[PDB]
Amino acid sequence: EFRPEMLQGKKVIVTGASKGIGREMAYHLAKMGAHVVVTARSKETLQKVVSHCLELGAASAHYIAGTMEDMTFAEQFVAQAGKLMGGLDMLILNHITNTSLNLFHDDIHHVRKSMEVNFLSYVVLTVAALPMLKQSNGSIVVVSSLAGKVAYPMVAAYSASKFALDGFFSSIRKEYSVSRVNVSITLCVLGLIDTETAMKAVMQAAPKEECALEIIKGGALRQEEVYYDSSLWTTLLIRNPSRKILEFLY
Amino acid sequence: RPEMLQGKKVIVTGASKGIGREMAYHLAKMGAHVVVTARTLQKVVSHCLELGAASAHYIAGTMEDMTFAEQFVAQAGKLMGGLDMLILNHITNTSLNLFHDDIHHVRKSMEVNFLSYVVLTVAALPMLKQSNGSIVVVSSLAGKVAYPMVAAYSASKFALDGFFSSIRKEYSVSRVNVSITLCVLGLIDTETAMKAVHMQAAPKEECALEIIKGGALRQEEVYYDSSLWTTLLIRNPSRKILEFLYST
Amino acid sequence: EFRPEMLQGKKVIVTGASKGIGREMAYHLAKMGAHVVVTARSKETLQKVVSHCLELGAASAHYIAGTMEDMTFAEQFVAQAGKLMGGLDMLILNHITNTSLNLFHDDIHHVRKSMEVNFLSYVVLTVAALPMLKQSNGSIVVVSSLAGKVAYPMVAAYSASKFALDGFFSSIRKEYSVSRVNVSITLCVLGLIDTETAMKAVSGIVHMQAAPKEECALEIIKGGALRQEEVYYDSSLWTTLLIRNPSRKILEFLYST
Amino acid sequence: GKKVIVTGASKGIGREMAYHLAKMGAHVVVTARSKETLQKVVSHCLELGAASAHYIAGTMEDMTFAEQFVAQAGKLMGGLDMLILNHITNTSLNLFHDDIHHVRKSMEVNFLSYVVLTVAALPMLKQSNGSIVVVSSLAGKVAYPMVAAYSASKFALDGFFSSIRKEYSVSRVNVSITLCVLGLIDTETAMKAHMQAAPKEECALEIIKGGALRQEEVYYDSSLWTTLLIRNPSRKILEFLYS
Ligand SMILES: NC(=O)c1ccc[n+]([C@@H]2O[C@H](COP(=O)([O-])OP(=O)(O)OC[C@H]3O[C@@H](n4cnc5c(N)ncnc54)[C@H](OP(=O)(O)O)[C@@H]3O)[C@@H](O)[C@H]2O)c1
Ligand SMILES: NC(=O)c1ccc[n+]([C@@H]2O[C@H](COP(=O)([O-])OP(=O)(O)OC[C@H]3O[C@@H](n4cnc5c(N)ncnc54)[C@H](OP(=O)(O)O)[C@@H]3O)[C@@H](O)[C@H]2O)c1
Ligand SMILES: NC(=O)c1ccc[n+]([C@@H]2O[C@H](COP(=O)([O-])OP(=O)(O)OC[C@H]3O[C@@H](n4cnc5c(N)ncnc54)[C@H](OP(=O)(O)O)[C@@H]3O)[C@@H](O)[C@H]2O)c1
Ligand SMILES: NC(=O)c1ccc[n+]([C@@H]2O[C@H](COP(=O)([O-])OP(=O)(O)OC[C@H]3O[C@@H](n4cnc5c(N)ncnc54)[C@H](OP(=O)(O)O)[C@@H]3O)[C@@H](O)[C@H]2O)c1
Ligand SMILES: CC1=CC[C@@]2(C[C@@H]1O)[C@@H](C(=O)O)CC[C@H]2C(C)C
Ligand SMILES: CC1=CC[C@@]2(C[C@@H]1O)[C@@H](C(=O)O)CC[C@H]2C(C)C
Ligand SMILES: CC1=CC[C@@]2(C[C@@H]1O)[C@@H](C(=O)O)CC[C@H]2C(C)C
Ligand SMILES: CC1=CC[C@@]2(C[C@@H]1O)[C@@H](C(=O)O)CC[C@H]2C(C)C
């Protein structure tokens, strides 16, 4: 079972931590006395978040501002974050490029950036953080969505990026479960959450602060997948036993 | 009915070797207009015409190049004066390997295996809109479930499902009468695949055939594996519920 | 004297902010910690700008993409931007329709599009902002040109719309003095500036030194912050001097009675 | 015997110009919206020795009318020597609030219609090596309150017609363009709308004189003081400098 003391003194990265769920996660991590490095584009808002993390009781708290459209930044960020903390125990991959509910016409650039920020940068950040996490026997936490497990209209490019996370990180999970690499991988399937962006872009939305905690919890407990939706009807059918079998079979 | 492919205008990517080739042959034998592509093609074009192909042309190039991909569909459209079935089959080359460091291969996989299919589809959309046609996406078990050794690949095929399943439901809620067929294929007896992977491997001829059948029939998904125990279990009933459920 | 701190936490709009001078202005405003909302038609290039402004230290940075051919968009843009920032201090009217130096024959559609985008939308945007500007005792910054003060060939439709800005905004400036509305109106008269667009359009026909866009942009903002009536900016100091019109300031000060 | 168009010629300075033009034995086509007052002007023109005199009614809100008006007036006279653009939309003195309609309408009638009318006349004018006369205002060279929309339209004329004047200058196109900056004039419209006002009858003459003499600009005010100031030598320098 989960105890907030499991995070005390743990060295933790939170991406897309300036707004929404990622911010809540940083604050939670702080109140559990964790070393935290937050990141996002907003140089200004990030510093505001760091100050609040120290007040809430972070062992330490830094920011590095940048955009995850830049794969170079992502490599460097992990190196620099590891320097500021003296290691890394948990990498939380939460950031997304902004997406709207729209029928797809011909916007190939939106598909491309979506795939870059929402998927590729996670692989880059993963690669850079893997030495430290192998050493700490750490966790990678991937934030995904219902839209990454089931099809919904109006969100194709986004959905395509969330499906890839599952495909790529689940394949890696198995690869770590045989090469003995003792890093856990936690895919989080979230329903609608009551963040500013989500509401001002669109069902019942679950509370952001409780959501953030469930992500941290699942990651701390080293769970393979985490589900969180405002409904229990939703959450229960999102699991898929047919897959567990096929996988176990081969 | 093999008559449904009579005189229809079709593109087949990755049609130089393996399944894409067999798809061209079967399509030639039903007398369809075909434009094949890859980077051996002429040898393929010969056999196609002499099997009963209404018209068989080619355009060689790399689907690494998105500009090439956008032009190809137009040029192939010029060459046939319209389009009824776009078949997306090509993939960049993959060796079974523990993913360690290869961000290059990850990025190229998303480009060729996923991103090009989207470019091709944008280009073909006008012609397919008028012809009330069909898009056929060749995917894999690895686009439905996880396997080690193939992460980059799995991610690209997963990407296809997320994307094309999403625009499928979009077209229903726009009445755009273009069908979308995701082909979930188990191990097939193609040249390259055998020289990369123990398990029973299905025959490439019934595969190519099966794919085309499903595309012609406008089936949402096509399953095909040398194990019939699996094929029933590879379908996901849990998912179909939730999609119709949230359809509110 | 102007202090970069003057703009910190000030809520600002910049139109035409995807390229050239508008882009540079947004950047400068970001460095100074301003709340910024940018606009133009291209949402891809606008997203790039918003990212950079956040990196550079914008208090906030949004965009809203649309054409200023649409007066509905312009009237709405301000509302949405006002919402995003919780007010408005400075309105910077920078965008123009695309125009290429060509002798005028019969192109009335160009002429009408030039008055629409270059002049009319500015009026629309101003009307929309004035309520929020009144409250903050804010500023309107109107970017014009030498071709808005003197005649040049090949750019008639353009010239006419720029001249028109002068007549109109100069008139409501005097209105606001009398009515005691405390909103400043800064008209910026610029020579050739080394923006990508300008160079591509003048390159093989016009011989002159182009002033730097980065400096140009900073001048406008300073002029607007210091609530100056006119800002002049050309690479030649001869030009910047003989641009002002004293005889006109007399005539205006005469009829003030 | 010169063929001339006069727009906004039902009253005020337009009407007075029509009279002077008739009294010099010129062929004249007048226009405005009101058919009734136009009929009256056509006759008084016939009385004063007009070589010919007809009217065509219509609103210069309509660019189709303007385009076709110049065509019809040109056929009716078999050519054109002088185009006098004088008309304006009805404008009051008011602090501008949010009435974008007035602003849009002002640029349409007062500036945009003039361009259309000009474009239409150009072949006939090139043929006669004729003249465009644009009536403008103090408020088109300097800023006054209460008249924002109006001034904007007048400024626009200056910008536009001064640019094309330098255009025709290098194309060698032999059509003169005369910009007329007028102070307050004692027209009925003007009056209803505490300074001294010049006489409408002399002003009209001054406009006609300047256009006949192919002057670039004409100034006219009830004050010798203003007229001297209204000129801009800084402008002439950089205009000629950047040449
Ligand atoms: N909200 C929901 O209902 C919901 C549901 C399911 C899954 N999720 C997942 O939860 C995660 C976050 O959701 P959210 O609602 O919290 O999103 P959000 O509130 O919009 O926050 C997104 C974060 O990413 C940052 N960001 C945006 N563009 C970036 C870029 N190019 N490089 C780096 N950072 C960038 C943003 O900060 P800056 O703008 O300052 O850069 C912000 O901190 C995402 O993975 C999303 O897919 C959310
Ligand atoms: N074989 C199986 O067991 C199996 C199982 C499940 C799914 N699938 C799927 O079925 C499809 C066909 O696979 P396959 O085994 O037939 O493959 P294959 O025999 O290796 O054929 C690959 C095809 O793609 C072309 N290609 C390679 N790189 C390309 C590029 N950059 N741009 C454009 N074309 C390129 C190749 O032509 P060139 O070499 O001349 O360029 C060739 O025609 C694939 O989508 C695969 O994922 C296959
Ligand atoms: N560069 C010079 O030498 C110079 C000299 C004197 C005066 N100026 C003045 O400075 C200002 C900016 O000039 P610049 O050279 O920086 O211009 P620019 O680089 O051409 O930028 C024009 C901006 O306006 C936007 N725009 C164009 N058409 C639009 C429309 N229909 N609706 C909305 N936005 C539109 C463009 O974005 P999208 O196309 O993506 O919408 C772009 O962001 C103008 O007012 C110009 O008159 C410039
Ligand atoms: N009055 C002054 O003190 C003064 C001073 C400086 C400059 N100016 C300029 O001198 C010119 C003459 O002014 P003014 O005082 O003579 O004016 P006015 O006496 O009111 O004459 C205006 C003329 O324009 C016509 N008109 C109005 N709306 C029209 C429309 N939509 N389409 C076509 N014609 C239309 C009127 O005819 P209908 O009403 O019958 O349609 C009338 O014949 C104007 O360009 C003005 O700006 C005047
Ligand atoms: C039905 C549904 C679709 C997806 C989203 C809402 C909800 O989960 C959420 C998600 O990222 O999963 C938040 C934003 C929204 C997007 C449509 C932009
Ligand atoms: C277990 C299994 C994994 C995937 C593949 C074999 C089989 O389907 C096939 C596929 O693409 O689906 C062909 C190539 C191969 C890859 C490991 C390279
Ligand atoms: C002589 C001269 C004329 C005007 C311009 C160049 C220069 O200032 C500049 C302006 O907007 O003022 C930029 C674009 C250009 C136009 C001719 C298209
Ligand atoms: C101070 C002054 C302003 C302009 C006008 C009077 C004078 O010239 C004249 C003009 O058009 O030039 C006539 C109408 C009037 C307007 C205020 C309505």
DSSP structure class, residue C5: G
**DSSP, residue by residue, D68-118:** HHHHHHHHHHTS-SEEEE------------S-HHHHHHHIIIIIIHHHHHH
Looking at all shown ligands, the one closest to residue C141's CA atom is 3
- Catalytic residue list contains C158: yes
Contacts of B135 (CB under 8 A, 6+ apart): B85, B86, B88, B121, B124, B128, B164, B178, B179, B180, B181
**Does D181 lie at the interface with C, CB-CB under 8 angstroms?**
no
| Helix or strand holding residue B97 (H, E) | none
CA distances from A141 to A21, A172, A175, D237 (A): 13, 13, 16, 70
Check: CB of residue A69 under 8 Å from CB of residue A113.
yes
Angle among Cα A59, A30, A87 to the nearest 5 degrees reads 50
- For residue C46, give the nearest of C30, C69, C70, C22 by alpha carbon: C22
Secondary structure of chain A in HEC code, one letter for each residue? CCCHHHHCCCEEEECCCCCHHHHHHHHHHHHCCCEEEEEECCHHHHHHHHHHHHHHCCCEEEEEECCCCCHHHHHHHHHHHHHHHCCCCEEEECCCCCCCCCCCCCCHHHHHHHHHHHHHHHHHHHHHHHHHHHHHCCEEEEEEEHHHCCCCCCCHHHHHHHHHHHHHHHHHHHHHHHHCCCCEEEEEEECCECCHHHHCCCCCCECHHHHHHHHHHHHHCCCCEEEECCCHHHHHHHCCHHHHHHHHHC
For B30-183, where are the alpha helices, taking DSSP H only? 41-49, 66-80, 103-109, 116-131, 151-172
| Helix or strand holding residue B16 (H, E) | none
Q: Which of residues 28-87 of A touch B (CB under 8 A)?
A: 71
Q: How crowded is residue C137: how many other Cβ atoms within 10 Å of its Cβ?
A: 12
Helix, strand, coil share of chain C (percent; to 5): 55, 15, 30
The SS3 call for residue C243 is: coil
Instruction: For residue B163, give the amino acid letter.
Output: F
Q: Is the CB of C117 under 6 A from ligand 3?
A: yes
Q: Is the CB of B165 under 6 A from ligand 2?
A: no
Annotated binding residue at D9?
yes
**Does B157 lie at the interface with A, CB-CB under 8 angstroms?**
yes
| Helix or strand holding residue C121 (H, E) | helix C121-136
Angle among Cα C42, C48, C50 to the nearest 5 degrees reads 100
Distance from C-alpha of C172 to C-alpha of D104, rounded to nearest angstrom? 16
Distance from C-alpha of C170 to C-alpha of A13, rounded to nearest angstrom? 55
Instruction: For residue B211, give the amino acid letter.
Output: I
Structure tokens at A210: 């409780």
Please give the distance, rounded to the nearest whole angstrom, from the Cα atom of residue B85 to the centre of ligand 2: 19
| Helix or strand holding residue C185 (H, E) | strand C184-190
Structure tokens at C53: 């402004």
| Helix or strand holding residue D185 (H, E) | none
Q: In what order do the strands lie in the sheet with C90-93?
A: C60-65, C35-40, C11-14, C90-93, C139-145, C184-190, C230-233
Mutate to test the pocket of ligand 2, among B23, B39, B139 (most ligand atoms within 8 A of CB): B39
CA distances from C165 to B206, C13, C158 (A): 73, 18, 11
Distance from C-alpha of C177 to C-alpha of A104, rounded to nearest angstrom? 51
Subunit partners of chain C (3 or more CB pairs within 8 A): A, D
Q: In what order do the strands lie in the sheet with A11-14?
A: A60-65, A35-40, A11-14, A90-93, A139-145, A184-190, A225-228
Give how far the C-alpha of residue D49 lies from the chain's centroid of Cα atoms, to the nearest Å. 23
Q: Which residues pair with D56 in a beta bridge?
A: D31
CA distances from C250 to C102, C211, C246, D142, D194 (A): 36, 31, 6, 10, 19
Distance from C-alpha of A148 to C-alpha of B237, rounded to nearest angstrom? 16
For chain B, domains (ranges, CATH) are: 1-248 (3.40.50.720)
Check: CB of residue B137 under 8 Å from CB of residue B183.
yes
List phi, psi (to 5°) of A58. Answer: -65, 135
Distance from C-alpha of C151 to C-alpha of C154, rounded to nearest angstrom? 10
Cα atoms found within 13 Å of the Cα of residue C167, Cβ hemisphere only: 30
CA distances from A210 to A49, C237, D204 (A): 18, 63, 82
The SS3 call for residue C11 is: strand
CA nearest ligand 8 atom 12, residue:
D137
Compute the nearest-CA separation of C69 from chain D (Å). Answer: 13
Structure tokens at D240: 């000629």
Resolution of this model in Å is 2.6
Structure tokens at D50: 């007009």
The SS3 call for residue C37 is: strand
Cα atoms found within 13 Å of the Cα of residue C122, Cβ hemisphere only: 30
Inspect the interface and report whether the beta carbons of A44 and C51 lie closer than 8 Å. Answer: no
Mutate to test the pocket of ligand 2, among B13, B19, B104, B194 (most ligand atoms within 8 A of CB): B19
